[PDB]
Amino acid sequence: GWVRPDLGDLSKVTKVKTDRPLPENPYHSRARPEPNPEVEGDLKPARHGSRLFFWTM
Amino acid sequence: DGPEKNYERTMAILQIEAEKAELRLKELEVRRLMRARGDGPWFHYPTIDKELIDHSPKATPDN
Numbered sequence A: 001g002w003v004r005p006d007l008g009d010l011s012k013v014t015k016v017k018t019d020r021p022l023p024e025n026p027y028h029s030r031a032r033p034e035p036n037p038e039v040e041g042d043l044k045p046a047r048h049g050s051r052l053f054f055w056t057m
Numbered sequence B: 001d002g003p004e005k006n007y008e009r010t011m012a013i014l015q016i017e018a019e020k021a022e023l024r025l026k027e028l029e030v031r032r033l034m035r036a037r038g039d040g041p042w043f044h045y046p047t048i049d050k051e052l053i054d055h056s057p058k059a060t061p062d063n
C-alpha cells in the first residue's frame, strides 16, 4: 500500500512534534556588552551660546 | 554712569564669564574621558549594524 509522492510533495516544509526542548544558547554566546547609557531629557539652549572664545552668541 | 550701575554691571559680566570658564574646563575633561573609555555619545565610531545578519535556516545546519 505504498503510494509514490506527487511532484512537489517531498519538498514541502513540514511540522514535526518532539519532546527534546528548544536549545537555549545554541551558539554558546557570552553575555552581550552593556549598551551605552541613553541620553534623554529636554533639549535646552546651549548655556551662554557657543562659548567659543569671545563670542556672546 | 553712576558707580552702582557700573559696579553691578561688572558682577553680571563676571558671572557669565565665570560660568563659561567652568563649562570650558568641564568640556575638556568630559572629552578626555569620553575618548579614553568610548562610553559616551562623542567619539562613537560605528560598528557593523546587526540588522544586516540573516537568521534564516541555511543550506547546511552548522552555522
Ligand SMILES: CCCCCCCCCCCCCCCCCC(=O)OC[C@H](COP(=O)(O)OCCN)OC(=O)CCCCCCCCCCCCCCCCC
Pocket (backbone or CB within 6 Å): A054, A055, A056, A057
Ligand atoms: C563685523 C563687524 C566688525 C567689523 C570689524 C571687524 C573686526 C574683526 C572681525 C573678527 C571677528 C570679531 C567679531 C566680534 C563680534 C563677535 C562677537 C559677538 O559679538 O557675538 C555676538 C554678536 C552679537 O552681539 P550682541 O552682544 O548680541 O549685540 C546685540 C545687539 N542687538 O553676534 C555675532 O557674532 C555677529 C556680529 C558680527 C558683527 C557685525 C554684525 C552687526 C550687525 C551689522 C550688520 C550691518 C547692518 C547694516 C546693513 C547695511 C546695508 C546697507
